[PDB]
Amino acid sequence: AGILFEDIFDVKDIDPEGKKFDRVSRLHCESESFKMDLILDVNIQIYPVDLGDKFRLVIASTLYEDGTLDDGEYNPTDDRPSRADQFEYVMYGKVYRIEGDETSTEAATRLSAYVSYGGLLMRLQGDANNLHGFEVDSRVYLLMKKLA
């Protein structure tokens, strides 16, 4: 399995700075298992969300569960059993920044991963143990599925 990260998050705010964009919103989410905060740009026109929504999010290296990392080109017309069949909102991006936390002057253990899904910003911040496998200039798949 190429699952680099997987966690269930709950939304705490939809637009802290106002309705800037009509189609994209800046959701802030907190995890229950760990203290992993997520600031993610999402498309509400095609995938509507609410304030009290809770969703499972998985960041994977590849879209195929069998472990085949052959992602030279993606053909949407091809039909084959993939991980996206088990989720509802799949994005494709690249981890373009890994930044350490500057709030803690000493004994800091928190990092943050900045990923640009075609311009849509995603900051995943939390303990460095959960961010294992994240490297710069690495293209990944985000899979979000709303829960009951």
């Binding site: 004994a107 460095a128 490297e135």
Partner: protein
């Protein structure tokens, strides 16, 4: 009344520009007629038409103002370092510590091609290398990164990641840019200065 005042302001601006155009045209004519004799020779000394030297070196250093990337500075070391790290990311090479970075910088700078370079640019390169090494040291002290390369979280090595290949690429790029940004002999520096002052 407001329309009349706005028309007054517009006519004032128009006559101001009309006088400014003529005044600057005359000033530019005088400046170019006075400065058209200077030229950059091959011995890096700006001399007049009669052979008298105006400057032993243009601008004190000898860099092309048209090829000035920074604010009156030849290169922006931060942007060049970021570009070198982005264009040539080496995933099969480990990161460098402060001591290793200083050692490889001192070993590369002492080569033959860096001898002909100016001393001020080498001092600036050394200062930037010392600064980035201090930053890496502070990061590794904050996050407890060990220089041996056996730390369990490898993502910690992605905060300030530097490899000797990127160091060599950055140094070679800086040297090439500093060599190509120098004043080319034969350029009419006086006319360029007159125009860049008159415009």
């Amino acid at each position: 009344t407001e329309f009349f005042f706005h028309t007054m302001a517009g006519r004032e601006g128009l006559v101001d520009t009309a006088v400014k155009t003529a005044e600057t045209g005359y000033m530019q004519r005088r400046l170019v007629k006075s400065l058209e004799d200077l030229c950059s020779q091959y011995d890096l000394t700006v001399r007049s038409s009669t052979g008298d030297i105006i400057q032993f070196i243009y601008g004190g250093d000898g860099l092309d103002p048209a090829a000035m990337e920074g604010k009156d500075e030849p290169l922006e070391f931060k942007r060049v370092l970021d570009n070198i790290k982005a264009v040539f990311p080496c995933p099969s090479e480990p990161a460098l510590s402060k001591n290793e970075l200083i050692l490889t910088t001192e070993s590369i700078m002492k080569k033959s091609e860096f001898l002909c370079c100016q001393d001020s640019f080498l001092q600036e390169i050394k200062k930037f290398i010392k600064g980035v090494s201090e930053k890496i040291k502070k990061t590794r002290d904050k996050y407890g990164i060990n220089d041996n390369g056996t730390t369990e979280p490898r993502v910690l090595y992605q905060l300030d990641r530097i490899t000797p290949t990127q160091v060599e690429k950055f140094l070679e790029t800086c040297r090439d840019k500093y060599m190509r940004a120098q004043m080319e002999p034969g350029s009419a520096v006086g006319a360029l200065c007159a125009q860049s002052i008159g415009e």
